[PDB]
Design a protein around this ligand. Structure first.
Ligand SMILES: COc1ccc(OCc2ccc(COc3c(Cl)cccc3Cl)cc2)c(Cl)c1
Lengths: 68, 262, 235, 272, 235, 68, 60
């Protein structure tokens, strides 16, 4: 039940282990039945800001005149 | 074009020749409750055309000295035809809205109105007692309320007003008004447009709620650039508010609710 | 049992750790979610929305609705600035309280491009051309249109399209700037001038306002979460 | 939590496309990038928004309460669960209208002799009992309620690493409401003014219950005081509807204000 | 040995944890089970069994067998209620001590439909029609048959089938209600009225009792285990 | 001898790990010989209440007359 | 609309099927069939009075 993800290496050691292998991976295993007990995975996604930045009914191009 | 539109709901139609597009809040169009998100088990009532139509609330007048206006939904529509009837006869109710604000002037007038639709628009009170505003004052109905230029604490201990004291630059809630643009909005700049149109989906942490106990949306109108004309220190232009509920569905029918007033 | 060896750091409490812990309310029937409109995934989404800038912080205007209004007039052409600002989004008093500035105050570093949009609120009969400018740090802050015109600038012609946007490109020495006023990571100057002049016919207001807006571009990012000075608690 | 787009090189322009001009009346923000208004070079973007994700923004243990017990009714204390007793976490949560997450609670317990030269006591054990709205609240530091046959309790031994437990999403709605524009009651026509009156913006009188804390050891005449600092961290976070942050000082559980109403300083319009 | 790091929460005792521990009586020969009738798997099974409601809590009747008896008579038709109740299954004094109410007092939240069954204990020669009603919260509590008839109701005709069941559907704003009296999660009102009137011939008793029963429907659930106030211990 | 079960995720993080993978599973291993030492699995079944709700000899339909 | 080009305004044209009190305020009129006319380039506005009748034909 182990989950193996890879790390985003910031500072690199003068090793090939700093660039590949299990040496740039980390392992995770959940010990509790309730999902609330789990830690945060932090592999979180993003989205389009459009719902806030452009909640416009008739879609407009920046090059084209906004007021038409 | 971006400027000419026609909105038809039920037996009511609105036309405009100077629009600046329309905003659909959070990109969500109003919809009915899906079976996967349903909660009350009884068969809902959906008045449809009888309730989902354009209702014109009272016209307010904009002057050089105006600070702003506010309304609460569904509150402002509680006395509107069959929408109000269904609201009071049912324990639970849900609805989206099409808010159409109207304000025409001339090519020699200036001014800009910021029209904001705020989910859970809680306003600040007038006393040192927290959350002291009473039901009757929080729900003015179609006449709504007004913003003030400053905070004035109610000191009458014998007869506290128990009312709101929404200061304009503090957006009536302790936040800076310039940041209110994070909420769905449009601007009625007199040199550009006649109106502002906002389509609001139902927003809440529940699928359906009590319309009498809870107001889902708040409409705030603030003069971003004050009204000015030619050389007439004296200038008044009306601001009419027309709102239409959408996808109305009510649950929990019983005897009618008659809330306490004034 | 299995032989173990306790390493330094044991029994400590790191406020930023990420471990598992036992659930105090086991087998709880959690209320499922509903599709509520307006969900947010990243704080940077909020920094990309235009927010009005309190440009007029003069003693009579600060902390009133007038702090947002910058007045123009139909006077003859002048080379003096209409407004001046420093590119310190988290610390300049005029930028520090915008939605962008508020978020930047929860982080120690910022990087990316910004854009300033100005709205003309004069009558339809009013015309005019304005010069919006951005000068990277290192030289004297522009005090005349002649100096401002030598840096990044957009000549705004007023008409149907009521607004104009000037993008302040990411021009920096360091890979990230600090959210505090610091000369090492200084950003430059923003200023506005009249290109020609505001002209209005008779029976028309000779003074009008313009409103400014600021938002982050799609290449903007912040790092190192910290506490803001914008909220306090006495006793 | 990802990458940002590269800057593409952009040359000069002389066209009928004018991205610099717009109309903010529509309610939209102009999506310009540098190459729209200036000549740009190609830059391969390596910066990411990994730390500004909704999760990383809240991934910190914030203090929400400091419960105090004097082991010489103060032999036990009760804290009504809330996030509004402090200001820092509260302000961050209020950037949004609704939220949904799990919670991690860490308890830092400290104690000391009030007297520099008097008294002595053996190591203390604390009991932190959660009293869900409805359960009987302790009247004495040692009455029957402390048997916890159903209420979750945490027994902490002084000196041990801070205690820590996780709580699931416990709301009765599909999300937690940071703002509730309404009342729990509707006053009906005809009833006395005393009737149907409730607080504005308040839901249940007892939303999440409270914590009852006590020292389990038999109290000695020695003067001792203990403080339990409660730290809470939202994990597995989802938030809806952004709002402008609090600009003036908080004045209670509501959006009420009173004191620091003039937050901005003075600055010349033409002063850099 | 293997390097380890102690995380916060170590050495604590969570009353609701679920860990393994050594057995104090190893290799014990456990007595095997036998198939005993009446095994229970879920507490909700018990909440679905009809239990008699102590409807008549008047000073002379409360805490006696008379608290369970609601008397009717052959009087001319009246529009006044025979009984009134609030849908607060865990807190209303008349519901809080039924098997359903007892179980609800060990939990903080409840959700689902309920059903009330009424048994007519008059003679065979007695007839009558009654109206049982349920009004969702928010309006004035029904005080006449005219108001009650506008909500959920079942018109019970007395005859061979001695009993009648009225289902109180789950009509709520929140996904779960609280087991305490709280207006935010209020449930509504239950009332009974005479539709026509109880009619009996000569040589027949003119007054008789009806008994009420309450049980949960198959969509009923509770959550958040808590301690009940229905049991205490002095000293 | 590890037992790998899946959790019933309540609150979901903005990750795909919150919806799939070993990240929504939990692992268990018994360390003691006596079953008494074991924790509770909590993967408990339900049953028909009929033995209590309808301990009737001659089965009856709700739509049909109970007294026949 | 035969006003000058510089004149603007919004008007509400209404139709109320028989049976109730004839509308005397905009508040009553707005509850029936209506078209909100915004004055501008298109000088005219049309309001259709739909056939809403009990009988299949009305008398002249
Ligand atoms: C929107 O932001 C929110 C929403 C809800 C919150 O509180 C809900 C809540 C409900 C129950 C418990 C009980 O938790 C505990 C248990 Cl079981 C055992 C021991 C100790 C504790 Cl501590 C704790 C918090 C908070 Cl603090 C912020």
């Amino acid at each position: 039940g182990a989950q193996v993800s890879s790390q985003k290496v910031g500072a690199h050691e003068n090793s090939n282990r700093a660039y590949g292998g299990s040496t740039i991976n980390y392992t995770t295993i959940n010990y509790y039945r309730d999902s609330a007990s789990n830690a945060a995975s932090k592999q979180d996604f993003a989205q389009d800001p459009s719902k806030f930045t452009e909640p416009i009914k008739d879609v407009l191009i920046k090059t084209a005149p906004t007021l038409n | 074009s971006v400027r000419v539109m026609q909105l038809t709901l039920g037996n009511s139609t609105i036309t405009t020749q100077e629009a600046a597009n329309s905003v659909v809040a959070y990109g969500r169009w109003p919809e009915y409750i899906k079976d996967s998100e349903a909660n009350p088990v009884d068969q809902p009532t959906e008045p449809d055309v009888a309730a989902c139509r354009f209702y014109t609330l009272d016209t307010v007048t904009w002057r050089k000295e105006s600070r702003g206006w506010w309304w609460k939904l569904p509150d402002a529509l509680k006395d509107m035809g069959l929408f109000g009837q269904n609201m009071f006869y049912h324990y639970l109710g849900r609805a989206g809205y099409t808010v159409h604000v109207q304000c025409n002037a001339s090519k020699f007038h200036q001014g800009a109105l910021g029209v904001f639709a705020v989910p859970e628009m809680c306003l600040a009170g007038d006393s040192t007692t927290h959350m002291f505003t009473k039901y009757e004052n929080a729900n003015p109905g179609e006449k709504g309320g007004e913003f003030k230029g400053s905070f004035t604490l109610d000191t009458n201990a014998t007869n506290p007003a128990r009312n709101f004291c929404p200061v304009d630059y503090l957006f009536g809630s302790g936040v800076l008004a310039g940041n209110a643009f994070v909420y769905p909005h449009q601007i009625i700049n007199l040199r550009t447009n006649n109106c502002a149109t906002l389509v609001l989906p139902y927003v809440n942490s529940l699928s359906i709620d009590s319309m009498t106990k809870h107001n889902n949306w708040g409409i705030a109108i603030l003069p971003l650039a004050p009204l000015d004309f030619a050389t007439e220190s004296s200038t008044e232009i009306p601001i009419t508010l027309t709102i239409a509920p959408m996808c109305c569905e009510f649950n929990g029918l019983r005897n009618i609710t008659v809330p306490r007033t004034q | 049992g299995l032989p173990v060896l306790n390493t330094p750091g044991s029994n400590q409490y790191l406020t930023a750790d990420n471990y598992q812990s036992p659930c105090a309310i086991p087998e709880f029937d959690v209320t499922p979610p509903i599709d509520i409109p307006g969900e947010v995934r990243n704080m940077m989404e909020l920094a990309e929305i235009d927010t009005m800038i309190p440009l007029n912080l003069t003693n009579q205007r600060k902390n009133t609705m007038d702090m947002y209004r910058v007045e123009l007039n139909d006077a003859a052409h002048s080379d003096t600035p209409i407004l001046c600002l420093s590119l310190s989004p988290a610390s300049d008093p005029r930028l520090a309280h915008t939605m962008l500035g508020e978020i930047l105050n929860y982080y120690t570093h910022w990087a990316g491009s910004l854009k300033f949009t100005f709205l003309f609120c004069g009558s339809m009969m009013a015309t005019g051309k304005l010069l919006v400018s951005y000068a990277p740090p290192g030289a004297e802050a522009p005090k005349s249109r002649k100096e401002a015109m030598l840096g990044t600038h957009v000549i705004w012609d007023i008409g149907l399209q009521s607004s104009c946007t000037m993008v302040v490109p990411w021009i920096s020495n360091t890979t990230y700037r600090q959210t505090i006023n610091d000369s090492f990571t200084e950003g430059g100057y923003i200023s506005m001038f009249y290109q020609t002049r505001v002209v209005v016919p008779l029976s028309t207001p000779r003074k009008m306002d313009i409103l400014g807006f600021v938002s982050a571009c799609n290449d903007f990012s912040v790092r190192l979460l910290r506490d803001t000075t914008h909220i306090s608690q006495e006793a | 939590a990802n990458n940002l787009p590269d800057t593409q090189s952009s040359g000069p322009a002389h066209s009928k496309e004018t991205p610099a001009l717009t109309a903010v009346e529509t309610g939209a923000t102009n999506p310009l990038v540098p190459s729209d208004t200036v000549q740009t070079r190609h830059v391969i973007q390596k910066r990411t928004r990994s730390e500004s994700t909704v999760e990383s923004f809240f991934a910190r243990g914030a203090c929400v309460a400091i419960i105090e017990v004097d082991n010489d009714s103060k032999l036990f204390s009760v804290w009504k669960i809330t996030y509004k007793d402090t200001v820092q976490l509260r302000r961050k949560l209020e950037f949004f209208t609704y939220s949904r997450f799990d919670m991690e609670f860490t308890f830092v317990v400290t104690s000391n002799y009030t007297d520099a030269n008097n008294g002595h006591a053996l190591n203390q054990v604390y009991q932190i009992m959660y009293i869900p709205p409805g359960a009987p609240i302790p009247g004495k530091w040692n009455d029957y309620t402390w048997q916890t046959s159903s209420n979750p309790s945490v027994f902490y031994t002084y000196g041990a690493p801070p205690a820590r437990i996780s709580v699931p999403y416990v709301g009765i709605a599909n999300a937690y409401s940071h703002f509730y524009d309404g009342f729990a009651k509707v006053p009906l026509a005809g009833q006395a003014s005393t009737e149907g009156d409730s607080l504005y913006g308040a839901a249940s009188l007892n939303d999440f219950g409270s914590l009852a804390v006590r020292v389990v050891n038999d109290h000695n005449p020695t003067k001792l005081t203990s403080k339990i600092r409660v730290y809470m961290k939202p994990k597995h976070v989802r938030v809806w509807c952004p709002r402008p942050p609090r600009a003036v000082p908080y004045y209670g559980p509501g959006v009420d204000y009173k004191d620091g109403l003039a937050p901005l300083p003075g600055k010349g319009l033409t002063t850099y």
